[PDB]
Design an enzyme around this catalytic site. Sequence first.
Site: not given
Ligand code: Q6A
Ligand code: ZN
Length: 259
Positions: A63, A93, A95, A105, A118, A197
Amino acid sequence: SHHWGYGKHNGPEHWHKDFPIAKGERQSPVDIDTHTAKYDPSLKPLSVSYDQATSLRILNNGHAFNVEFDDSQDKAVLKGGPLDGTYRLIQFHFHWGSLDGQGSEHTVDKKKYAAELHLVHWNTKYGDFGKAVQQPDGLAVLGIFLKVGSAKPGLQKVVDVLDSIKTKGKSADFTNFDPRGLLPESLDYWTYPGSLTTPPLLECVTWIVLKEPISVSSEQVLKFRKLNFNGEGEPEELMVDNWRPAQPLKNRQIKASFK
Ligand SMILES: COc1ccc(/C=C(/C(C)=O)C(=O)Nc2ccc(S(N)(=O)=O)cc2)cc1
Ligand SMILES: [Zn+2]
Ligand code: NA
């Protein structure tokens, strides 16, 4: 298992079927209307304390890519501003878009930036990230806009490792990276309560979006766009346009740290 992404068939307009909170009351991102955001003199300064930050690894998750930190102690933390207590950096990370006119975003008076950084932090009163995401004040995400102009020297170590994590599931050692090199000069910000997001779209985030963008070069963002959403050996799908559009503000007010 879920199969969400950014395409016509699996993109943001589809997410509500597996993740009904996609149509919830505090979804992110949002358009920041700079004229309706109110200066809040009650906001405490904002404290970014990244001196002891310990980066470990960079991962293409299909992603985006995450730069992961050691969050086993208070090594890199965010405090102050709208926040009560201490939020620990876990990952950052980006976008970004297929072209420089889209990718962010959050938008500012409907302006889209070329990309958005972010920096994700979790509230240490909940003990671990997985418990924090179940709480309305569990996360703080520091959002920074990227515009295309001069190169960002502090970004180049990230750009140079991307060739080694081209496809989904690839990772590389990424120690001794200093996230202070990704900040703009000013910490002036907007803040509002929102969500992740991406799926699972949990409504656990205090958003802190800096007003001042950072400048990156065309060459730096072009290297982001050479990443792949797909795994090794699969048909190439360039990792571009991995942004969710602005969501309804509903019953929320965006506050400004500055006049
Ligand atoms: C049960 O709930 C969850 C379980 C696992 C995760 C895992 C994550 C990962 C991929 O490590 C995570 O951190 N996700 C994340 C996604 C978007 C944003 S953002 N764009 O809003 O900043 C920030 C962070 C997140 C929630
Ligand atoms: Zn993000
Ligand atoms: Na811990």
